[PDB]
Design a protein around this motif. Structure first.
Motif, PDB file in Angstrom:
ATOM      1  N   UNK A   1       0.801  -1.223   0.000  1.00 13.90           N
ATOM      2  CA  UNK A   1       0.000   0.000   0.000  1.00 13.90           C
ATOM      3  C   UNK A   1       0.836   1.277   0.000  1.00 13.90           C
ATOM      4  N   UNK A   2       2.050   1.219   0.549  1.00 12.00           N
ATOM      5  CA  UNK A   2       2.967   2.348   0.438  1.00 12.00           C
ATOM      6  C   UNK A   2       3.273   2.666  -1.018  1.00 12.00           C
TER       7      UNK A   2
ATOM      8  N   UNK B   1       2.727   3.707  -4.261  1.00 12.46           N
ATOM      9  CA  UNK B   1       1.624   4.430  -4.876  1.00 12.46           C
ATOM     10  C   UNK B   1       1.507   4.188  -6.376  1.00 12.46           C
TER      11      UNK B   1
ATOM     12  N   UNK C   1     -11.403   9.305 -12.002  1.00 14.95           N
ATOM     13  CA  UNK C   1     -12.197  10.051 -11.034  1.00 14.95           C
ATOM     14  C   UNK C   1     -11.701   9.846  -9.610  1.00 14.95           C
TER      15      UNK C   1
ATOM     16  N   UNK D   1      -6.441   1.643   2.477  1.00 14.53           N
ATOM     17  CA  UNK D   1      -5.459   2.025   3.485  1.00 14.53           C
ATOM     18  C   UNK D   1      -4.737   3.307   3.097  1.00 14.53           C
TER      19      UNK D   1
ATOM     20  N   UNK E   1      -5.862   5.642   1.138  1.00 15.30           N
ATOM     21  CA  UNK E   1      -6.837   6.714   1.285  1.00 15.30           C
ATOM     22  C   UNK E   1      -6.910   7.184   2.729  1.00 15.30           C
ATOM     23  N   UNK E   2      -7.068   6.246   3.663  1.00 21.63           N
ATOM     24  CA  UNK E   2      -7.153   6.630   5.067  1.00 21.63           C
ATOM     25  C   UNK E   2      -5.853   7.237   5.564  1.00 21.63           C
ATOM     26  N   UNK E   3      -4.735   6.891   4.938  1.00 26.38           N
ATOM     27  CA  UNK E   3      -3.428   7.280   5.434  1.00 26.38           C
ATOM     28  C   UNK E   3      -2.808   8.389   4.594  1.00 26.38           C
ATOM     29  N   UNK E   4      -3.608   9.038   3.749  1.00 24.54           N
ATOM     30  CA  UNK E   4      -3.325  10.279   3.030  1.00 24.54           C
ATOM     31  C   UNK E   4      -2.399  10.100   1.836  1.00 24.54           C
ATOM     32  N   UNK E   5      -2.006   8.878   1.487  1.00 26.89           N
ATOM     33  CA  UNK E   5      -1.172   8.688   0.309  1.00 26.89           C
ATOM     34  C   UNK E   5      -1.970   8.753  -0.982  1.00 26.89           C
ATOM     35  N   UNK E   6      -3.290   8.639  -0.905  1.00 27.01           N
ATOM     36  CA  UNK E   6      -4.158   8.679  -2.068  1.00 27.01           C
ATOM     37  C   UNK E   6      -5.369   9.536  -1.741  1.00 27.01           C
ATOM     38  N   UNK E   7      -5.929  10.227  -2.729  1.00 28.56           N
ATOM     39  CA  UNK E   7      -7.153  10.994  -2.483  1.00 28.56           C
ATOM     40  C   UNK E   7      -8.376  10.095  -2.466  1.00 28.56           C
ATOM     41  N   UNK E   8      -9.334  10.441  -1.604  1.00 22.17           N
ATOM     42  CA  UNK E   8     -10.601   9.721  -1.592  1.00 22.17           C
ATOM     43  C   UNK E   8     -11.361   9.919  -2.893  1.00 22.17           C
TER      44      UNK E   8
ATOM     45  N   UNK F   1     -12.099  17.043  -9.765  1.00 22.06           N
ATOM     46  CA  UNK F   1     -11.944  17.726 -11.047  1.00 22.06           C
ATOM     47  C   UNK F   1     -10.741  17.144 -11.784  1.00 22.06           C
TER      48      UNK F   1
END
Ligand SMILES: [Mg+2]
Ligand SMILES: [Mg+2]
Ligand SMILES: [Mg+2]
Ligand SMILES: [Mg+2]
Ligand SMILES: [Mg+2]
Ligand SMILES: [Mg+2]
Ligand SMILES: [Mg+2]
Ligand SMILES: [Mg+2]
Ligand SMILES: [Mg+2]
Ligand SMILES: [Mg+2]
Ligand SMILES: [Mg+2]
Ligand SMILES: [Mg+2]
Ligand SMILES: [Mg+2]
Ligand SMILES: [Mg+2]
Ligand SMILES: [Mg+2]
Ligand SMILES: [Mg+2]
Lengths: 96, 67, 87, 117, 32
Positions: B15-16, B18, B28, B53, B55-62, B66
């Motif tokens: 998950x690290x 990216x 999207x 994971x 997403x929750x840990x800020x490495x990916x946007x929810x 745009x």
RNA sequence: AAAAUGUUUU
RNA sequence: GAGAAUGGAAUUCCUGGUGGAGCGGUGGAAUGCGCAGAUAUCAGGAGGAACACCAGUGGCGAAGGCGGUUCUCUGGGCCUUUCCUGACGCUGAGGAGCGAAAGCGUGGGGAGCGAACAGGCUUAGAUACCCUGGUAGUCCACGCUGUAAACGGUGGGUACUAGGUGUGGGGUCCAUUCCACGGGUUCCGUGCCGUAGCUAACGCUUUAAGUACCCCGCCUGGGGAGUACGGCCGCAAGGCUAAAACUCAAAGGAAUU
């Protein structure tokens, strides 16, 4: 004696030295009871994919540590009660 | 059908990491379906868990919103 | 049940050195597992699925003990006397 | 009164009517219109023509308030979204990144019961 | 099944339950 | 869009 | 499966900025809300609940059922060549436990939803559909209740009886690799088509409703009636067990036109 990987998002206002001091004290509380610390990686300052506690960036730390479940839970509660760390996650890769 | 979508292999998910998660996240910001991502069931499950994971840990946007 | 005390139980309840699947070993392992699951259920009284697993273990151990007693009654008495005296 | 130049647009189109809000990029609304404001009322204010009228009225008032090209965000399962986009174009001011700011729950709150028409 | 059987049983059950509702007090004063 | 009913012939 | 912490979006409410006449809602409306500044829009905050995408043609569970993430605790399944015990198997009256939702008790919580309720519409009337509100409840803790179209309307176990074709899980083999793409093959699932066979037909057909053996539950015309009386269980609602008089000559299944 299992192994865990803790990812830590520290407030971006930290600029070295005190980040190392926090890491040293938390690794100390890990190592007080037979908990070896395999690796500590500091990714540095990175832009967060979304704002966390009104902060657009954060310091990323990865701690690979072999220890007991009680010790890792106690480290987690310390990181939670701390006011200087934005977020924590405790992965336990079942294989490695 | 779905055989023309050739099975894709990824190795460790991590998950690290990216790069793979971006390759499997939609434009999207959503998780792509299995029939479009061309993953096995287990690899797709691991990719979805890693995306959540990150997403929750800020490495990916929810949601990239745009574009 | 990190396999350490499991191997310990197997060796100290085996009938002969190579024994790993006889009813005595099975009953000893099942009893240790029942004790551990009883403690886990005391912690989590709401784990109905694990309680069903515990009941399955209890019934399996009961059938094994029934076989043991049907064959050799004195051996059954010694085994249960070692293992909690069947209270 | 004051020239805001850039501004932005919010096009909320629902199943019942359409509301257009021209606002300062700070979020403060500069002008606004709706099918109810421009004449139409009731069922006939859900039509795309009502959205056309409301959008052009809001754009015009923003114009005499002195407002140049717009970045637009549209929202809602209405029918007057595009038509309002054209309307802003026809009144005349450069339209930028049409957005999709419409919300979407992650299950979240329970929706109301299904209608039994 | 023709659903007619279930409808007949439904009406019988509903009538009996209505009877129980209307005679709830008397039963608990003297009886079941 | 809602819009009910149809005794006893021999 | 249980416990604990925790993530983001959305709704609602609150505070502030902006702005001004409607908003909302429907088949059409009105009740309703709104110049005491609503709707909208931006920022900040509070709170409860459910976890988009992944996600179905899929997985797991004895069934009921089970979907944010992480950790802790824990149950069962599948495969394997060796290994161990050596028929220890199967089923199971009574009994016990588990058992959606609604409901009940004590305490907590309450965003949204929403029986009851109030109002507006429709109508011959509308104790409804539809609309605006809205309390229990939905949520949590601990108990109680123990019923569902709890259905595959198909009890469990076992052996045998064409295939064809998807898909989930574990092995193993092959060529190029010395990954994997691929093909096979094996064991266990899960669908569809389909032969023999079976069935009143519909259909079932190796996941049988086929051919057989073992054990359990159950049926004996339709109503009366899963009702009365009695007893047991429950705080209550009720549940379980369970008739008779009387009455009809049908009730019913599939299919045809
Ligand atoms: Mg709980
Ligand atoms: Mg979906
Ligand atoms: Mg299916
Ligand atoms: Mg031998
Ligand atoms: Mg019972
Ligand atoms: Mg309930
Ligand atoms: Mg309650
Ligand atoms: Mg209460
Ligand atoms: Mg209502
Ligand atoms: Mg069911
Ligand atoms: Mg039945
Ligand atoms: Mg049975
Ligand atoms: Mg059978
Ligand atoms: Mg099969
Ligand atoms: Mg039959
Ligand atoms: Mg009764």
């Amino acid at each position: 004696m299992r192994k865990y990987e803790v990812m830590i998002i520290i407030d971006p206002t930290v600029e070295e030295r005190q980040v190392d001091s926090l890491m040293e004290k938390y690794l100390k509380v890990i190592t007080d009871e037979k908990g070896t610390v395999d690796n500590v990686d500091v990714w540095g300052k990175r832009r967060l994919a979304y704002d966390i506690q009104k902060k657009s960036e954060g310091i990323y730390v990865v701690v690979n540590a072999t220890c007991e479940p009680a010790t890792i839970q106690e480290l987690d509660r310390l990181l939670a009660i701390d006011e200087k760390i934005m977020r924590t996650k405790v992965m336990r890769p079942e294989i490695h | 059908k779905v055989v023309p979508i050739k099975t894709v292999h990824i190795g460790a998910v991590d998950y690290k990491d990216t790069a793979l998660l971006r390759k499997f996240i939609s434009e999207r910001g959503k998780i792509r379906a299995r029939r479009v991502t061309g993953l096995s069931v287990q690899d797709q499950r691991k990719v979805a868990i890693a995306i959540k994971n990150a997403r929750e840990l800020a490495l990916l946007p929810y949601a990239s919103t745009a574009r | 049940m990190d396999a350490a005390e499991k191997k310990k139980i197997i060796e100290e309840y085996a009938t002969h050195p190579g024994d790993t699947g006889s009813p005595d070993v099975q009953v000893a392992i099942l009893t240790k597992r029942i004790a551990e699951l009883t403690e886990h259920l005391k912690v989590h009284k709401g784990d109905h699925h694990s309680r069903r697993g515990l009941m399955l273990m209890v019934g399996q151990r009961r059938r094994l003990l029934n076989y043991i007693a049907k064959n050799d009654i004195e051996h059954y008495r010694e085994l249960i006397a070692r293992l909690g005296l069947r209270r | 009164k004051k020239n805001v130049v850039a501004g932005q647009a919010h096009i909320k189109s629902t199943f019942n009517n359409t509301i257009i809000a021209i606002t300062d990029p700070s979020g403060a609304v500069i002008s606004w219109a709706s099918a109810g404001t421009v004449g139409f009322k009731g069922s006939r204010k859900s039509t795309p023509f009502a959205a056309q009228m409301a959008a052009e009225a809001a754009g015009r008032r923003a114009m005499e308030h002195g407002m140049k090209r717009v970045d637009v965000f549209v929202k809602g399962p209405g029918s007057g979204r595009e038509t309002a986009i054209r309307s802003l174009g026809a009144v005349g001011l450069e339209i930028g990144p049409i957005s999709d700011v419409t919300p979407v729950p992650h299950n979240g709150c329970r929706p109301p019961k299904r209608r039994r028409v | 099944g023709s659903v007619i059987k279930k409808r007949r049983k439904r009406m019988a059950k509903k009538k009996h339950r209505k009877l129980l509702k209307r005679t709830r007090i008397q039963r608990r004063r003297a009886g079941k």
